[PDB]
């Protein structure tokens, strides 16, 4: 639909920032369509990854870092609060310690700091979604 | 670029069919982007699949039918001849016993049928590439 993806924007973090993203998955669930939004070091895409997280819809999520282009230890959900063929509202706040997921209002995935949040430069969202909106906040010093 | 992704074509298969796909990921390898096409029983995207071919850039390649819903024995590859950054030129020949999977001019992967090939209604391509080229043969009897 209306954004571009793969969807890229270069982007800062800190403790209160929010990255709100509307979006709706290609395919039914029954195809295990994927969405991934990655918090990059740099603008190139093949920059460390502070922050991955990755669903594939109606089965599971994995989060990871990527970190001097080696991925990190994995951590798996099978929490799965995206509903069939629905429109999605993600939400990702920067907590002192950790990000928060939450979907459609729901606190739905954590993953602890690995690297503080003040060396993302870049926000990528890609996969199997239509993107009709992407924000982050800027509002605190 | 410049065909659709999602990409959906009607299509019949018999032996002696050849599906021919040129295309190109759109992320380098580190990022694993995906690469999927489904030989399909009917039109609807929730229809079931006489063959499932899905890689993982860089990874490995799975394999499957889903049959009446429900997905069947994976089997799985880590052959990899697809290279990173670059466009590949895939094709599928249908074979009397078996579907085989052409990289680059190379054979790189048989799947033995499970289900007739008479039974596809339709193809589909997609997930993270971006793709120039689609074509079915249609000269044997």
Same mark, same amino acid.
């Given at each position: &639909?209306?954004?571009?993806? !793969?969807?890229?924007?270069?982007? %800062?973090?800190? *403790?209160? &920032? *929010?990255? *709100?993203? $509307?979006?709706? !998955?290609?395919?039914?669930?029954?195809?295990?369509?994927?969405?991934?939004? =990655?918090?990059?070091? +740099?603008? $190139? @895409?093949? %920059? =460390?990854?502070?922050?991955?997280?990755?669903?594939?819809?109606?089965?599971?999520?994995? #989060?990871?870092?990527? +970190?001097?282009?080696?991925?990190?230890?994995?951590?798996?959900?099978?929490? #799965?609060?995206?509903? =069939?063929?629905?429109?999605? +509202?993600?939400?990702?706040?920067?907590? !002192?310690? $950790?990000?928060?997921?939450?979907?459609?209002?729901? %606190?739905?995935?954590?993953? =602890?700091?690995?690297?503080?949040? @003040?060396?993302?430069?870049?926000?990528?969202?890609?996969?199997?979604?239509?993107? *009709?909106?992407?924000?982050?906040?800027?509002?605190?010093?």
């Amino acid at each position: &639909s209306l954004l571009p993806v !793969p969807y890229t924007e270069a982007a %800062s973090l800190s *403790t209160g &920032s *929010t990255v *709100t993203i $509307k979006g709706r !998955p290609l395919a039914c669930f029954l195809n295990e369509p994927y969405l991934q939004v =990655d918090f990059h070091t +740099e603008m $190139k @895409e093949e %920059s =460390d990854i502070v922050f991955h997280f990755q669903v594939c819809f109606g089965r599971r999520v994995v #989060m990871n870092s990527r +970190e001097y282009g080696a991925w990190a230890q994995q951590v798996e959900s099978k929490n #799965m609060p995206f509903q =069939d063929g629905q429109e999605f +509202e993600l939400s990702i706040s920067v907590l !002192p310690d $950790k990000y928060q997921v939450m979907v459609n209002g729901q %606190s739905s995935y954590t993953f =602890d700091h690995r690297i503080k949040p @003040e060396a993302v430069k870049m926000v990528q969202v890609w996969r199997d979604i239509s993107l *009709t909106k992407f924000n982050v906040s800027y509002l605190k010093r």
